[PDB]
Design a protein around this nucleic acid. Structure first.
Ligand SMILES: [Co+2]
Ligand SMILES: [Co+2]
Ligand SMILES: [Co+2]
Ligand SMILES: [Co+2]
Ligand SMILES: [Co+2]
Ligand SMILES: [Co+2]
Ligand SMILES: [Co+2]
Ligand SMILES: [Co+2]
Lengths: 91, 225, 138, 90, 138, 225
DNA sequence: CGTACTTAGGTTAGGCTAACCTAAGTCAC
DNA sequence: GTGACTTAGGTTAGCCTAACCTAAGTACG
């Protein structure tokens, strides 16, 4: 189940990367929960939060705080539920 | 199980609930006649259309003049049949209700009149239930009566068994037990005290004792000594 | 109206066999006052359930199971008639119309009690023999 | 099966007795078909065409002709279907 | 709306497992926008049919049969998304909402044809792995 | 047997019957969707209540403007799906209708527009059936077409296969047979002569021959040489 | 050429499960 | 005290069989 337990153990969630002190990472997976909001998906496409793109995850502190992300074509604020549902490889 | 006549049984189930002092909701008809929620609502809609009842704003079922007249007619046939089965035919006490439950649907007013004369103008069923609508067939206070459960919660004590509701009569195994220990009309019982609702009430008859469920104890009426 | 369609079709075929008439669907239509299509359909449903067969000449033959049920309904009918005449005292002419409904709701438990009460009757008040007393155990 | 095949083989139908040239007979059975008509059953009771009573069956000729019967309290006309459904001993 | 209630409950539980969230009835109510009683009742039906079990800690555990069905619906979903993006050219944002309905009507016969057409894809256009490709035979 | 959407299939069955030149009665819907008489009448009453059709005096089903619009919408999705399954995905000819029968209920107009451009503005299904309602999606007299049964009774002769009706496509084993012997759109067949009605028509294709039932022969349209 | 029966297309009554709802409780960290 | 879930009593959609009907045929002797 590469779906549930990734074979690539280096795969990490955007919210966990933020809380651990940010970092540059390659976007890999956008979970089905994120895809349900079409307006959000448009915003992710615009700023470049799409699989196969490098993004910058801004360091965050606390729980239920928006995670700030910087893509090739600008930045956006992800909700904690959304940020939890986006997986990346750091560097 | 086959109702023989759906309309008559729906009317008689509403009558039974009114006699037991329970609010006649479609949910009651569903659990008692063992039919689905959707089945009951649809059948009640046909009876509302035909003009035998109406659904109130609080969902409680109200019989029309025609509905009440028809319900009493079926109940009269039921309890006259029970009298015939006990007094004349000699069918066992526990099986009589089940039989009468089918007979109430096929008996003519003609036969009812002949039964009134044969049985000497009976006023109560073999289970102490008053026979209504005898006025249209050419022919007590009941205030002092209290429910076994309400007596038990209020302190208990000794009381005379007067009525067993139609609801209780459906279980022949229970009616066999009630006969054995002697929780039958015209027999004294000792009702043990309980605290709060939904508690199994204990009773001690002439030939031993047994445990009544809350809905069974609520259905048995007594006069406290 | 009929109370039980199946039992009334079975008893109607039994009646025709007692009268020495050929039991056809046309005979059932006349006596129960139902359309030809209704009778053909109900007979087909009763044929499906194994209660009768349509012969090569189109006469309705009761099966072992069909006759057992026919006898059961007729026995209940004629015991009901005796109770209605001998005990209850319903008018001689009105009795059959009453027993015609009672035959569908009477248990074998009542029948055995009626046999005792009426003193082991062999006939109805109209002289017709009571069949299937063997099957009661009396 | 006394119902379908009588044990007493001497039992005969009123219409068959009539066609064969009448006779005095004891009324035994009135089939379920006859009982369906209450007004008729009243007439059979009134004139005395009931089980246990003797009746006189008038001789008839042909089919689909009403059969004339005489009881203790007078007589009546039976339809062929009705006369077929009443069995007697001669 | 949901097209198939059972399949959407199974896939919703699979989604929560992929997100590393605890699969509770409260989570299904939020995401499918249904009342708590509705979700409890439907989950009870799916428990009665042997598709899931409610654990001691009230978390929903898919059975062998439930997981097989969940995998099947997700595989159809993600192959539909690839077809919608790579071949049909539906807008990147509208694709999931389309595939959310297509996942319920796609035969395994089409899935095998889509696998050949799309050149043996291992992921959806959103990077999510395609499960149960073993089960197709590819 | 799951219809996915009951309303849409009832609408599409009425459309199919209009295309085959058969009177759309509830009896036809019962036969084709394999549902009881009482089931069909109740479902038609819900669609009548929501103004998607009306029942005439001769009891034939008439689509409203909203009903016809919805029916055409479903059929357009159906035949665009069949095109995609044949032309792009490459699903086997005999299995394509059954797939499209489900897909027609879940396809958005958004996807329909994308499919029109991908498939190059298709006007007919893979079975030669005209794709309707393309005007709403932003995009031939065929009076000379005659039914294989009507050709056989009138003398027979050679003809080009043009349309296979939806009714015929439901049987994959039959569609497998028609494919092999070569009774497919754009192929010549020789329709053998028969007398009267309700008689199995014989046809000789490019790769052999077979027998068509009266309702199958009525559903296949051809242009005679 | 009337009797028996079939074909065709309905009807109402009386059942069912699946899948949605609100209002007003309980139960537990 | 908010979150999770149960209790209680409904709803519409979409299925079913049994048991009635009429109108207009066919098969027969
Ligand atoms: Co009783
Ligand atoms: Co009853
Ligand atoms: Co009788
Ligand atoms: Co009867
Ligand atoms: Co998706
Ligand atoms: Co979905
Ligand atoms: Co098609
Ligand atoms: Co379809």
């Amino acid at each position: 189940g590469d779906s549930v337990e990734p074979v690539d153990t280096d795969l990490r969630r955007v919210d966990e990367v933020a809380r651990s002190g940010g970092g540059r990472a390659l976007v890999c997976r956008i979970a089905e929960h994120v895809q349900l909001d079409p307006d959000l998906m448009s915003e992710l496409k615009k700023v470049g939060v799409v699989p196969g793109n490098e993004i910058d995850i801004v360091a965050v502190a606390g729980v239920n705080k928006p995670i700030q992300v910087q893509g090739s074509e600008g930045g956006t604020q992800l909700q904690p539920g959304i940020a939890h549902a986006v997986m990346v490889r750091v560097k | 199980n086959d109702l023989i006549d759906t309309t008559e049984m729906y009317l008689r189930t509403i009558y039974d609930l009114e006699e037991e002092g329970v609010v006649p909701l479609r949910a009651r008809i569903a659990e008692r006649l063992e039919q689905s929620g959707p089945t009951v609502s649809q059948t009640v809609a046909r009876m509302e259309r035909d003009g035998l009842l109406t659904v109130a704003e609080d969902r409680h079922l109200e019989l029309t003049k025609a509905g009440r007249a028809r319900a009493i007619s079926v109940m009269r046939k039921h309890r006259l049949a029970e009298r015939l089965l006990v007094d004349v035919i000699g069918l066992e006490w526990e099986q009589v209700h089940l039989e009468a439950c089918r007979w109430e649907h096929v008996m003519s007013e003609a036969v009812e009149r002949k039964l009134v004369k044969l049985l000497g103008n009976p006023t109560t069923s073999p289970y102490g239930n008053p026979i209504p609508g005898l006025d249209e067939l050419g022919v007590p206070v009941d205030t002092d009566l209290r429910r076994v459960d309400e007596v038990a919660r209020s302190g208990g004590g000794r009381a005379l068994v007067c009525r067993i509701a139609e609801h209780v009569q459906l279980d022949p195994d229970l009616m066999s037990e009630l006969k054995k220990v002697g929780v039958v009309p015209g027999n004294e019982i000792d009702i043990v005290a309980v605290a709060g609702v939904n508690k199994p009430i204990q009773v001690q008859g002439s030939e031993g004792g047994t445990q009544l469920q809350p809905g069974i104890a609520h259905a048995v009426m007594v006069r406290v000594k | 109206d009929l109370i039980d369609t199946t039992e009334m079709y079975l008893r109607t075929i039994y009646d025709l066999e007692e009268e020495g008439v050929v039991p056809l669907r046309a005979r059932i239509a006349e006596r129960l006052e139902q359309s030809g299509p209704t009778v053909s359909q109900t007979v087909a449903r009763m044929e499906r359930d194994g209660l009768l067969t349509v012969a090569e000449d189109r006469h309705l033959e009761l099966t072992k199971a069909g006759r057992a049920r026919a006898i059961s309904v007729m026995r209940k009918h004629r015991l009901a008639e005796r109770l209605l005449v001998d005990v209850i005292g319903l008018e001689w002419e009105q009795v059959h119309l009453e027993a015609c409904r009672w035959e569908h709701v009477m248990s074998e438990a009542v029948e055995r009690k009626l046999v005792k009460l009426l003193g082991n009757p062999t006939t109805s008040p109209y002289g017709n023999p009571i069949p299937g007393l063997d099957e009661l155990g009396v």
